[PDB]
Design a protein around this ligand. Structure first.
Ligand SMILES: *[C@@H]1O[C@H](CO)[C@@H](O)[C@H](O)[C@H]1NC(C)=O
Ligand SMILES: *[C@@H]1O[C@H](CO)[C@@H](O)[C@H](O)[C@H]1NC(C)=O
Ligand SMILES: *[C@@H]1O[C@H](CO)[C@@H](O)[C@H](O)[C@H]1NC(C)=O
Ligand SMILES: *[C@@H]1O[C@H](CO)[C@@H](O)[C@H](O)[C@H]1NC(C)=O
Ligand SMILES: [Ca+2]
Ligand SMILES: [Ca+2]
Ligand SMILES: [Mg+2]
Ligand SMILES: [Mg+2]
Ligand SMILES: [Zn+2]
Ligand SMILES: [Zn+2]
Ligand SMILES: [Zn+2]
Ligand SMILES: [Zn+2]
Lengths: 480, 480
């Protein structure tokens, strides 16, 4: 559909004139950031962002691509180079080390330099690299970890842990030799490595001993505690903090977030990862947006400021399933959380960065008409005279041969929330992609986010902006 | 391979400290641009840029992803939204209208507002939108069009033409009704619409009448002239310009580019598009880099400055064939041309933008090791126990079923210049992609290139920077 208003060149000339005016008004801050927020869209590459924008635009009353995402409104953009030291196409652990600790590492390790080796406990020590969140805490700021995955998953773990193996969620996962050598599981590291004021997401199970019924699924044993060392880490965490509260559901989160004197809040809302937003029980579970507001309620009380990590952690998972519907709906909720944080904080004193850890082999093609669904079919048949989707994957589990050929697909099918887009190569899981991802930035020192940078730049600019870390001699005036 | 130096966190800390220093030194110009250069990588999306960087890095003596492209060194980056008014995934014609005329248009039209309709000659008039190159010429600047495609192809045509149909290369292509209605073929528009000082690329055939032997392929009739109206457009062009010279080979280009008193230069080096760089006859044909130097030699003589359009036009073509080897080698040559222009011009007075018209359904995945060839196989077999490549396409002509299944592939095969990477969907041509592309910018007013913008922004910032177009009342000091 051709929007009549866009047929007039003045429509475009007006918009661009407005764009130039706004571009010209941009000025660098001379003041430091009181607060730091990194929003991490896990797997949210450039193709995911554009596709998400179109979907969200249509979710509203619009044609799609012309409607900005909240992240699109951020003034400063850079491209981030995501390679790990040992692999061109990275994982979440070693990219976390880069954008949270400012040092690149090897695939599947977290918070360690590339002198460490994956799954070799005895290469750990000396190679720990401290996150900017850790450094923010050392400087007196409150710190928060918020994600739709397990809080012990690779991305949030980058804020606090150091491990040669991202799979070491609880002691149950650590080989005896590594346990003997003192490599702690991530759940333990979560409560021991540093003080964290707010911890919100999934991952209940790793905190409790085997036999412990999950409170929300007391009749599904696979959801119960996993630990073999007898520890209740929630209880240990509560015991070492006054003002500490633990919640596992939305209503309790709500009460806690408004309760003055709740100073430490741990909200673990599923046994493992939180449900996709489309499957979320809105009585039992907070959305990402709700969790980030809950975090902000508590974190904003500290006069010295805060560091907050907010992850759209299941964007990635949607893409791995090659279910773009799940990837993009997670991305919209991620964008809503970004929008909400923007409503609850000031860019005068808060440096906010939105980025992705890496991308996916996700593409948006065919030649679909303006206003068409992102989940629709490309106009015109493929060379095999069957339809195909505008959304596709390079590889992954949507590769199908139905009696010896690529199957036709219909609009109703292509539009289903369970639909897996086709790929060129069958894999149980679609693969990450190695191309540059965006960094969006607003707030004090956001103008420093520019050009094409190593992913490590994200950690360093945030540390610099807040006068942390090796930049205590930033030469910045106090936050506005 | 793990580079030993990168195992030390100070490697990363040093680099990022250096990055912050450079970021902090960036200052906006208060002066206008004397010169304007747009480098257009046709089809050169974010995945193409990263893949190209890795290849080029290894072409040198390096592991790949850590080595900047010339374009990577540009300080300012924005994301450009490429949708056409009528289609989410655009073509080269209507994106040209956006980044060259500052107005979005409909798919397969050039230099027309979206009030025009494709292939409807009688919707043309009133809807012409004038390019910033045209406006630069009106302001006394010299102007140059340089590309590896036909100079009448959609992208260069955006600098000078206005047509409802990009396929109208010569009069031979225009229906009688449209000819009767006065819609001129692009080759005619090339010589008639405006004065152009330098025209370098392919497209000899459309300039000469049928029967005219091509000078370089006098024994292949399909390469001869196409025109039915009896016109020799080269002769007509030469006749209306003193100092005018026409060349069809590299040695003549060389002589002309150093010949003072050659004031107008038309170099048409193939009948149609120029050969891929890997197939270029270096005695007969100039590379893109060589052509852009030739252009700069002539254009730089004007004291009022110049506008130059330089296109890596066959990046796109490589991707359409799903031959990433051709796409990426074109991208490297495009980057070399950017590097060369940077050597021959000053960022004190030259605004240079590098961008793409749109992307492709090209992805870079698997989990390949550091230092591995971009054309190599992903480590580990696919779910069908056969190898797969790190480079893949969503759709296109690399979709193969060899006796009823996805064929295995070897390293020697994957690395061949003729190799087509696999896709999910068979198409004669791989399809453009609709995700945002990068804009890289350096020079006076380059800092205005920021955030997420409509593609039209590219035209407007360039016009603004040079105080052209509707921005004669820019409020800028004279060029430095
Ligand atoms: C780590 O332990 C393994 C297993 O015994 C051993 O082979 C290796 O040498 C150790 N490396 C270090 C750094 O001690
Ligand atoms: C939420 O958690 C509390 C325990 O803290 C429990 O009493 C309440 O029943 C829970 N709500 C639901 C709906 O399960
Ligand atoms: C263009 O010409 C066609 C063919 O005769 C006609 O149907 C149509 O109405 C014309 N449109 C305009 C704008 O004159
Ligand atoms: C280049 O063009 C000129 C005509 O301008 C011709 O005399 C010369 O032979 C050409 N060179 C080659 C190698 O064909
Ligand atoms: Ca729950
Ligand atoms: Ca030639
Ligand atoms: Mg994650
Ligand atoms: Mg082109
Ligand atoms: Zn990830
Ligand atoms: Zn992942
Ligand atoms: Zn194109
Ligand atoms: Zn194309």
């Amino acid at each position: 559909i051709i929007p009549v208003e866009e047929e007039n060149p003045d429509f475009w000339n007006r918009e661009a004139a407005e764009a130039l005016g706004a571009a010209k008004k941009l000025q660098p801050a001379q003041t430091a950031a009181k607060n730091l927020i990194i929003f991490l869209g896990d797997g949210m590459g450039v193709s995911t962002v554009t596709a998400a924008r179109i979907l969200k635009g249509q979710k509203k009353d619009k044609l799609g691509p012309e409607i900005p995402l909240a992240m699109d409104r951020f003034p400063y953009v850079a491209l981030s180079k995501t390679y790990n030291v040992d692999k061109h196409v990275p994982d979440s652990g070693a990219t976390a080390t880069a954008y949270l600790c400012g040092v690149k590492g090897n695939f599947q390790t977290i918070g360690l330099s590339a002198a460490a080796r994956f799954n070799q406990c005895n290469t750990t020590r000396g190679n720990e690299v401290i996150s900017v969140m850790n450094r923010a805490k050392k400087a007196g700021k409150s710190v928060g970890v918020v994600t739709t995955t397990r809080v012990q998953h690779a991305s949030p773990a980058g804020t606090y842990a150091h491990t040669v193996n991202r799979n070491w969620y609880s002691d149950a996962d650590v080989p005896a030799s590594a346990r003997q050598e003192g490599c702690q599981d991530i759940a333990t590291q979560l409560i021991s490595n540093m003080d964290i004021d707010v911890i919100l997401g999934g991952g209940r199970k790793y905190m409790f001993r085997m036999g412990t019924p999950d409170p929300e699924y007391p009749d599904d044993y696979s959801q119960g505690g996993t630990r073999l060392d007898g520890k209740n880490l929630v209880q240990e965490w509560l015991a070492k903090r006054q003002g500490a509260r633990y919640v596992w559901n939305r209503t309790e989160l709500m009460q806690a977030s408004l309760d003055p004197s709740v100073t430490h809040l741990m909200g673990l809302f599923e046994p493992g990862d939180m449900k996709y937003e489309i499957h979320r029980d809105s009585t039992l579970d907070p959305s990402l947006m709700e969790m980030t507001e809950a975090a902000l309620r508590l974190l904003s009380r500290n006069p010295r400021g805060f560091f907050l990590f907010v992850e759209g952690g299941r964007i990635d998972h949607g893409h791995h399933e090659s279910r773009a519907y799940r990837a993009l709906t997670e991305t919209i909720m991620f964008d809503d959380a970004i929008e909400r944080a923007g409503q609850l904080t000031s860019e005068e004193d808060t440096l906010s960065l939105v980025t992705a850890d890496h991308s996916h082999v996700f593409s948006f093609g065919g030649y679909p008409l303006r206003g068409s669904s992102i989940f629709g079919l490309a106009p015109g048949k493929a060379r095999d005279r069957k339809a195909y989707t505008v959304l596709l994957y390079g590889n992954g589990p949507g590769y199908v041969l139905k009696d010896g050929a690529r199957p036709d697909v219909t609009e109703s099918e292509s539009g289903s929330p369970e639909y897996r887009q086709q790929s060129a190569v069958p894999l149980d899981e679609e693969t990450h992609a190695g191309e540059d991802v965006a960094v969006f930035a607003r707030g004090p020192q956001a103008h420093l986010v520019h050009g094409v940078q190593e992913q490590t730049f994200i950690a360093h600019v945030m540390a610099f902006a807040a006068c942390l870390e090796p930049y205590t001699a930033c030469d910045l005036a106090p936050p506005a």
